């Protein structure tokens, strides 16, 4: 589970989820990758599930890059309580995903099994994503 060591402010406004990907729309480390076609919030649990799926399928070879980091904290109102009495305590850590953002990258693996591993990973994400490559 990716959790930042510290943050300046633990209670933050909800991240903007408008617009396309600000940056990181192209592969930078690996040969293949996952590119999100829809925006949304990506929690550390989802990131870990996808990473486990990719690594487990590719076994021992190849290396995986997690381009996004769940450094944005999300508070939760205390359960069964009326509205008010200040903001809640951080409960989830998310990354702000926008369309075109490359989430995961993979290298050192043949294309077919890389594609299958990316499929396994994508079936764990909460937003639509696609397999991309450096045109082979």
């Amino acid at each position: 589970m990716l959790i930042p060591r510290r943050v300046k402010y633990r209670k933050q406004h909800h991240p903007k989820r408008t617009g396309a990907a600000k940056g990181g729309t192209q592969l930078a480390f690996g040969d293949y990758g996952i590119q999100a076609t829809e925006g949304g919030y990506l929690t550390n649990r989802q990131i870990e599930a996808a990473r486990i799926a990719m690594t487990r399928y590719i076994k021992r070879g190849g290396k995986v890059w997690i381009n996004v980091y769940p450094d944005r904290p999300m508070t939760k109102h205390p359960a069964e309580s009326r509205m008010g009495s200040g903001k809640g305590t951080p409960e989830w850590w998310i990354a702000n995903i926008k369309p075109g953002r490359v989430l995961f990258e993979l290298s050192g693996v043949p294309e077919d099994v890389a594609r299958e591993a990316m499929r396994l990973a994508i079936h764990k994400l909460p937003m639509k994503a696609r397999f991309i490559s450096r045109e082979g």
């Binding site: 205390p78 309580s81 009495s85 200040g86 903001k87």
Partner: protein, 78 residues
């Protein structure tokens, strides 16, 4: 239940430029209220105790640069 350790804030102080570029002013008229010298006093402009820039003479307000400083001048009226 719970409570907030916040909720305090200070009253609005209403800073900012009070007379913009080219606006005719009288002597002593306040040009900008500010904290610190974001604008330095230029020609025909005095600086007060709380860094308020005011007019030392009648004329038109202009914003410019004097050496390396952002300054506010009052050009004497033609």
């Amino acid at each position: 239940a719970s409570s907030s350790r916040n909720g305090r804030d200070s009253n609005a102080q209403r800073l900012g430029v009070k007379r913009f570029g080219g606006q005719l002013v009288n002597a002593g008229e306040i040009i900008v209220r500010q904290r610190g010298t974001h604008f330095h006093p230029g020609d025909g402009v005095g600086r007060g105790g709380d860094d308020t820039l005011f007019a030392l003479r009648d004329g038109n307000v202009e914003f410019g640069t004097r050496r390396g400083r952002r300054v506010v001048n009052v050009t004497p009226v033609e």
